[PDB]
Structures are given as structure tokens and as C-alpha cells.
Nucleic acid binder design. Structure first.
Ligand SMILES: Nc1ncnc2c1ncn2[C@@H]1O[C@H](CSCC[C@H](N)C(=O)O)[C@@H](O)[C@H]1O
Length: 327
DNA sequence: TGATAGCGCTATC
DNA sequence: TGATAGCGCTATC
């Protein structure tokens, strides 16, 4: 993340729905806002969130009396995506984990906050022909909210990672918000090799497979894109290797392969997966953030998360719009 | 409330 | 297309 000195969200309160690792909290908090509630049901997420924020989120949002949710100005929610991901089956709303948006809507109905800040994978925008996003768009509009939605890639915001997510920002119509805008992109100046730990602390992630097939030569000139250097086995998810002089492929939560959830990388002639700390950095998390003790859950936790940086710029801009109230 | 690893399909240009 | 990347799926221990 980056430091934000002109704190745009200073007096605002916000709720952390589907808290996960709390990336939404770090971002809005860096803009001056205040977290008055968190919700997340995964026992391990709850522990990492307690470890870092001293709070344990409430459980399963599905059976939480919405009226119980504390008054708040911005509702943040990075809702489940398995049901909309290009990487899964795609049953959308027909999936158990696909109905969560309607929980957001109903919390929005009761608490009607000033802004609604949501996040999902790029394919949520095309899922079921555009039906999912339209239903979402209509539900929000139907609640007296605007609905600004756009796809932003992590790599365009200073983080060496390919992560294309849809950000949906809704302001109550009351507010008459007509100046909202998504952060303008900017030149990437950091790449994987920059966030990499010293070889000493990562020996153990190095994997030497006889079936490692190098298909491309390493690169010396940095590029804001994922450059595949080789594969292992058949080359499926988690079985492909990339140059650290490019950007990181996206991290995943249930991902598999020998380079599970991280993908492989060629570091000094060796081939390894990222350490949970490198995942933190690739998601823009600060080194002060305490990772969960279970590397597996840590990886799952980081793979479900959001790139903080992106969120900061959006949060600043939400604050910027909200703040322009001339005479 | 678990850790690991081989998928095997889709969306995109 | 032809090659890649995907906040995934799911069997086995
Ligand atoms: N019914 C439910 N109640 C609470 N949390 C839920 C839930 N269904 C899914 N979740 C959680 O919602 C998250 C989807 S991922 C979001 C991660 C979050 N943006 C962060 O910044 O890391 C996961 O943590 C998942 O465990």
C-alpha cells in the first residue's frame, strides 16, 4: 500500500463484509475512515483478522439480522466469486456461494449507506451473458443508488501482478454524486524480482522437477506483463513458470498444482513458488501485516484477497467525490 | 473446522 | 483459430 496524506475519508464509518484478510479495511483506514463492523465466517480468516485488527468478525452473514449491523457510511464487500470465475463451473446465482450479493443488497436496504464499494473477478461482468451484472446493476439502482462499474488491472496501479477485478461503486442518489471517476492508470515501476525475499529465506520452496520443460529464455528487460518461461508436468493451473522480470500471474484460493495458488518462478536459475510474504507484497500488503501460521490458509487467504493499492486510489476518489459539496 | 497436487474446462483475441 | 491465464474443482492420504 501507499501512504495517503490528504485523508479523504476522515469522518466516515464503514463495514467490512466478507472481511477475509481485511484488505478493505487497510485501504479505507489509510484514507482516514473508521471500521465499525467486520463480517467473515472462515475460522482461519477470523484468526488472521483478529491477529491484525484485534477484532474477530461476526459469522455467516446469511443468518445475521441486518438491523444489527451498525450505522455506516460505506459498505465494503469483496463477495465470493467461485460461482462467476472463468476458473470454475460458473453456476452463478444458482450456486450456494453465488447468492451473497443479495445479502449485500438486503443489508443495503436496511442500513442504506452513502456508498457501496464492491469487488469481484473480471468474469462477473460477462457471466451468464451479462445477466449477473445486470441483476446487480438493477438491484442497486432499484435501491436508489448509482452504479459505476469498471475493470481495473493491478499492474496499472503500481503492483507487479496481473489481477483484473470489477469494482462497483454506488452512491445514494440523495448525494447527487456526478464527479466520481476511477483512478487513471500510470506507468508500472516495480516487478516481481523487486518484491522477492533473499534466497536464504526461500530455499524450501524451490522445487526441482525432472519434467520441468523450459519453453522460453529468461528476460533481462522488465515488462508489465506475465512472461511464461516454462511448464512442469502437463502445464495446467499451478504447473507453469514465469519470469520474475515480468509481473506475477494472479494468486488463487483453491488453486492446485505443484505451485499451488502462486505459480512458479525462475529465481537465480532455480524454480520455485512464492512465500506467503511475497504473496503479501504482490497483493500490496505491508510487511507489518502478520500472516496466518498455516501457509496453506495464508495462501488461500491471500489468493481470495484484493490488491490494496488499487483500493486506495478508489477509496481516495470515493472520498474526493463525497467531499465536493459546494454552495 | 486440512494439506497437497493433477487436473480439464472456459473466455479471450 | 492457437496459446494463455483463471480470487477453481476435487481426489487421496
Ligand atoms: N456466508 C459467509 N459469511 C461470511 N464470510 C463469507 C461467507 N461466504 C464467504 N465468505 C468469505 O468471503 C470471502 C470471499 S473473498 C474476500 C477477501 C477480502 N476482500 C479480503 O480483503 O481479503 C472469503 O473470506 C470467504 O470466507
Amino acid at each position: 500500500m501507499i501512504e495517503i496524506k490528504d485523508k479523504q475519508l476522515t469522518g466516515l464509518r464503514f463495514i467490512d463484509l466478507f472481511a477475509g484478510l481485511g484488505g478493505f479495511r487497510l485501504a479505507l483506514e489509510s484514507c482516514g475512515a473508521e471500521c465499525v463492523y467486520s463480517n467473515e465466517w472462515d475460522k482461519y480468516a477470523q484468526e488472521v483478522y483478529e491477529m491484525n485488527f484485534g477484532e474477530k468478525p461476526e459469522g455467516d452473514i446469511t443468518q445475521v439480522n441486518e438491523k444489527t449491523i451498525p450505522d455506516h457510511d460505506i459498505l465494503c464487500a469483496g463477495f465470493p466469486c467461485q460461482a462467476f470465475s472463468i476458473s470454475g463451473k460458473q453456476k452463478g446465482f444458482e450456486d450456494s456461494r453465488g447468492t451473497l450479493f443479495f445479502d449485500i443488497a438486503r443489508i443495503v436496504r436496511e442500513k442504506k449507506p452513502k456508498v457501496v464499494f464492491m469487488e469481484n473477478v473480471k468474469n462477473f461482468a460477462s457471466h451468464d451473458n451479462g445477466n449477473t451484472l445486470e441483476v446487480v446493476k438493477n438491484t442497486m439502482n432499484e435501491l436508489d443508488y448509482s452504479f459505476h462499474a469498471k475493470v481495473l488491472n493491478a499492474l496499472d496501479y503500481g503492483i507487479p501482478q496481473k489481477r483484473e477485478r470489477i469494482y462497483m461503486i454506488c452512491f445514494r442518489n440523495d448525494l447527487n454524486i456526478q464527479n466520481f471517476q476511477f483512478p487513471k492508470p500510470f506507468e508500472l515501476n516495480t516487478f516481481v524480482k523487486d518484491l522477492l525475499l533473499p534466497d536464504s529465506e526461500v530455499e524450501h520452496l524451490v522445487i526441482d522437477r525432472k519434467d520441468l520443460v523450459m519453453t522460453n529464455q529468461e528476460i533481462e528487460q522488465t515488462t508489465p506483463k506475465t512472461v511464461r518461461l516454462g511448464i512442469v508436468g502437463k502445464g495446467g493451473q499451478g504447473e507453469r513458470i514465469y519470469s520474475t522480470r515480468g509481473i506475477a500471474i494472479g494468486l488463487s484460493a483453491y488453486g492446485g498444482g505443484i505451485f499451488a495458488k502462486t505459480g512458479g518462478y525462475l529465481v537465480n536459475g532455480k524454480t520455485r513458488k512464492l512465500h506467503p510474504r511475497e504473496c503479501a507484497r504482490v497483493m500490496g500488503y505491508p510487511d507489518s501485516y502478520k500472516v496466518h501460521p498455516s501457509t496453506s490458509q495464508a495462501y488461500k487467504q491471500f489468493g481470495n484477497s484484493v490488491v490494496i493499492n488499487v483500493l486506495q486510489y478508489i477509496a481516495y476518489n470515493i472520498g474526493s467525490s463525497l467531499n465536493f459539496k459546494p454552495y
